[PDB]
Structure 1
């Protein structure tokens, strides 16, 4: 038993809710919150911008030190950093950004990072401003992640569509 509340169960291991991931993280304090990162860990908008804002920019400060030491992530890759006031840890995962022309097949590789964590609160990778089809992203999630994932979908209209179209 865990503390996530109000989720619809999609599969054995995937759950979904119409929620603001920032508010969900602050209430749940999950072990892992996933950020929809880019390779530079520049948290300017979308989920990243909102998570970073909720940390009072501490996420960005930590991220800039990470990049200065290690260089950029790979598309499809990830790193574990602090969760600040939102979670124990933040798993920064880089899904392909369709608005940059990145290969959508890398979306499966991105979701594979979730398998290194038993339970995660996460957004749909490559959705929103990353330009992928969220229905496709949900399908890849379900077909790739084997650990327990709680998906927060900010847009109620999208949440209902994802549920109604789920196979």
Structure 2
């Protein structure tokens, strides 16, 4: 038993809700919140900009030190950093950005990072300003992640479409 509430169950291990991931994280304080990161951990917009803003820019400060030490992530890769006031940990995961021409097949590799964590609160990778089809992202999620994932979908219209079209 965990503290996630109001989720619709899609499969044995995948759950979904129309919610702002920032507010969901603030209330649940999950062990892991996933950020929709880029390889530079520059948290300007989308989910990343919103999560970072909620940490009063502490996420960005920590991220800049990480990059200065380690260099950029790989597309499809991840790193574990602090969750600040939102979670114990933040798993920064880089899905391919279609608006940069990155290979969509890397979306499966991105979701594989979730399997290193028993339970996660996460957005749909490569959705929103990353330009991929969210219906496809949900399918890859369900077919790749084996650990327990609670997906927060900000837009109510998209949430309804994702549920109604789910196979």
TM range (shorter): over 0.9
Structure 1 spans left out of the alignment, 5+ residues: none
Q: Distance in 2 between matches of 1:71 and 1:94?
A: 14
Q: Render the CA deviation track for 1:34-64: whole Å, top value 9, x for unaligned.
A: 0000000000000000000000000000000
- Give the deviation of 1:108 after TM superposition: 0.0
Q: Provide the aligned length of Structure 1 versus Structure 2.
A: 167
Partner of 2:2, secondary structure, is coil
- Give the deviation of 1:130 after TM superposition: 0.1
Q: Render the CA deviation track for 1:104-130: whole Å, top value 9, x for unaligned.
A: 000000000000000000000000000
Q: Distance in 1 between matches of 2:38 and 2:69?
A: 17
Matches within 5 A, 1:9-88: 9-88=9-88
Is 1:98–2:98 an aligned residue pair? yes
Aligned-residue CA RMSD (Å):
0.1
Q: Distance in 1 between matches of 2:19 and 2:87?
A: 16
Q: Distance in 1 between matches of 2:150 and 2:19?
A: 10
- Give the deviation of 1:71 after TM superposition: 0.0
